[PDB]
Amino acid sequence: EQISISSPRKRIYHNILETIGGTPLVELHGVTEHPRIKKGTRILVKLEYFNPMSSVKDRVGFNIVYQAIKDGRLKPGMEIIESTSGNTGIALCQAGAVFGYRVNIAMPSTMSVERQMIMKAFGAELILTEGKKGMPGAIEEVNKMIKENPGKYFVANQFGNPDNTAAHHYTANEIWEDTDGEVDIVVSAVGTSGTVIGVAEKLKEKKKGIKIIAVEPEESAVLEGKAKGPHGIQGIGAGFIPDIYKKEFVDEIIPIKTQDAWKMARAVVKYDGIMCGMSSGAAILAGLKEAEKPENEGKTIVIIVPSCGERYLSTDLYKIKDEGTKIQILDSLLN
Amino acid sequence: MEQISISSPRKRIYHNILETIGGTPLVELHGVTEHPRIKKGTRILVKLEYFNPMSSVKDRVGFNIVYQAIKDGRLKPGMEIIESTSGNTGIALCQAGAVFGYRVNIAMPSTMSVERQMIMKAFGAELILTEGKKGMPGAIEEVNKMIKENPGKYFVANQFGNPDNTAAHHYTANEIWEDTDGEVDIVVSAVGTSGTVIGVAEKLKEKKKGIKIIAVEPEESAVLEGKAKGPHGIQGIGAGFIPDIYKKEFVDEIIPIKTQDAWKMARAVVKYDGIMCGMSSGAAILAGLKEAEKPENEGKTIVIIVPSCGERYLSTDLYKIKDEGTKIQILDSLLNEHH
Numbered sequence A: 001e002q003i004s005i006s007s008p009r010k011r012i013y014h015n016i017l018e019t020i021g022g023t024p025l026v027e028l029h030g031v032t033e034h035p036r037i038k039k040g041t042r043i044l045v046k047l048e049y050f051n052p053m054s055s056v057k058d059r060v061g062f063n064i065v066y067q068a069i070k071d072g073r074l075k076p077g078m079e080i081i082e083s084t085s086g087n088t089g090i091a092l093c094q095a096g097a098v099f100g101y102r103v104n105i106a107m108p109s110t111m112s113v114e115r116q117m118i119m120k121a122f123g124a125e126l127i128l129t130e131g132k133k134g135m136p137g138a139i140e141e142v143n144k145m146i147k148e149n150p151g152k153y154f155v156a157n158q159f160g161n162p163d164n165t166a167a168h169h170y171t172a173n174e175i176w177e178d179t180d181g182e183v184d185i186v187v188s189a190v191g192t193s194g195t196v197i198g199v200a201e202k203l204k205e206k207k208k209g210i211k212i213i214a215v216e217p218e219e220s221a222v223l224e225g226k227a228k229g230p231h232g233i234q235g236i237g238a239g240f241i242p243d244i245y246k247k248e249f250v251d252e253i254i255p256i257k258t259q260d261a262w263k264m265a266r267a268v269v270k271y272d273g274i275m276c277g278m279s280s281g282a283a284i285l286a287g288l289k290e291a292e293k294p295e296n297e298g299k300t301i302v303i304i305v306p307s308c309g310e311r312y313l314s315t316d317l318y319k320i321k322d323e324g325t326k327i328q329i330l331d332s333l334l335n
Numbered sequence B: 001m002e003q004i005s006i007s008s009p010r011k012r013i014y015h016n017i018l019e020t021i022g023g024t025p026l027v028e029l030h031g032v033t034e035h036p037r038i039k040k041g042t043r044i045l046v047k048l049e050y051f052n053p054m055s056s057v058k059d060r061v062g063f064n065i066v067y068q069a070i071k072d073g074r075l076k077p078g079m080e081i082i083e084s085t086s087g088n089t090g091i092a093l094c095q096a097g098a099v100f101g102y103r104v105n106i107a108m109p110s111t112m113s114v115e116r117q118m119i120m121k122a123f124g125a126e127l128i129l130t131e132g133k134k135g136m137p138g139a140i141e142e143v144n145k146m147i148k149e150n151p152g153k154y155f156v157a158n159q160f161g162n163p164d165n166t167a168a169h170h171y172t173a174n175e176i177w178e179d180t181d182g183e184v185d186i187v188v189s190a191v192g193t194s195g196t197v198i199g200v201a202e203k204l205k206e207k208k209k210g211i212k213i214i215a216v217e218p219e220e221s222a223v224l225e226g227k228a229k230g231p232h233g234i235q236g237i238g239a240g241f242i243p244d245i246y247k248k249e250f251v252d253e254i255i256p257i258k259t260q261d262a263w264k265m266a267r268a269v270v271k272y273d274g275i276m277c278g279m280s281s282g283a284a285i286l287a288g289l290k291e292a293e294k295p296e297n298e299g300k301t302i303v304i305i306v307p308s309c310g311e312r313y314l315s316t317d318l319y320k321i322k323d324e325g326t327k328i329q330i331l332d333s334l335l336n337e338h339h
């Protein structure tokens, strides 16, 4: 019943990029109080919105740009360019501001207006594309832009760039150390797939039997072999299988309905006080569905939370009001 | 170019989100400090309170107010929490109430911070929306009515007069002390409740003689300096009165900062250091740069509090002006006042 807040970090950080990563792992309790989830089963959420720009992509924009500069692929005189669903452009704006490079962006018009609003203040340059066409339309927008041109642009290429995936070797080490090697299952909702694959490949170097679970929208279940379809889980469901995706590293794929992802997110902020985004609601409902399986009794389940509900205020995330008690709401999610 | 390394694993599993409050990072500024009148020796650091789980310094305050009340019995099963607030304190109370299992009632004018309304409601709060024309005093009047009519039912957070607000910042002070290895010379804090500036001064003045403590307030509403209350646009500070928890003896100097400068400074910080701080952080940073230019402060370590981040200000005019000028023109225009 005693509660201790966080101790001093005992570091002076040399710039904001050094504050990326080392995100906290937090036990869920409110949404896990359910007669089928057994007491020894631990459900932990890794809160990637503790990154300075509040999303998992901070690690991505940082590693892509910093390696490209160390590489020679980004050099003084070039600009950065990319297509995103939002968070990646914001992470590249952060790295761009620190390193001193200009940044240009293409993104679907349908993504929350909060995302559009962050880019620019840092020093970027935007282009909003058609919703309907989704991430592929953004990508085409980007190709257009480079086509011509010189050897002037470095293209971040977040769906095909292995520096995306490799940034999540740190994510995996943090899960390993924070759980003292006890993690059994990791659940990650998939956009670029750099988190699920980067985490999986680094954790399999640690312990072979860790189960890795990808999550995607039921309405666009492309990893499971379905076609691209309209969905509302912002930040995931790219509509294609990213070139960095490595299926041999993923044990199971869970489809989650858009409405259910949102409703889970509603429940997590109400019963645990954790303000997770839409794709977090998908990941957490998948993880809860794992936690009620009798073969997972006593296991440690780690669920990636990629973003904060506050970047979604303009959406319908917090529109509908759920009826029922806590137990009613959880029953409706699990059945 | 230096090796940049990211943060190491926390090596902790947190029992709930309130355990992730505090231990906020202290970060060097470089881009906005590159001006001839600031010396290569002096260290200008920002403590980023938006690393709290709800992205502001008030997480500490909502947590400690509710925690301390539970511990000493001012808050007991059955009662509900209430506060009149349209800002971060409201969010911070909702967070704490969500985890502790207590209902949270937040009163504010129906027309203020409807984004912040939504956040509060998402956390399960009852919002008490009062008449628009009446401003904050109408919210306070409603909370006064509700507590008068329901004796014993509510616990009033009372952020401007609660010593548990100031006391939470002994932790802030300790983080400053350990993170600088005792080298901190000056702390700059923009003042809302004054919990931060006083609670940090109380504890640091115990560590070492000679730590200068600087309060920052809007030039247009310089009530700590004894001017009259006035309209200003630096959200989160300039409450219009001297808060009950303010202790003037612990504050060495007060710096007035104009609203438009506070905004322009916040824009420069995100552009040149890539740190997306909020409006009151633009005020405190500009005050701190003005310190770093004083010849007597050469080689000193200056710590500036950054209470919130720019994402909570997207519907304001914070990022509407697009400043013309290269970096050096902008910093020179921000530091150029005489006296």
Ligand code: MET
Pocket (backbone or CB within 6 Å): A057, A083, A084, A085, A086, A087, A088, A089, A135, A158, A191, A192, A234, A235, A236, A237, A238
């Ligand atoms: C919808 S596919 C994943 C795109 C990624 N969420 C980005 O921030 O750009």
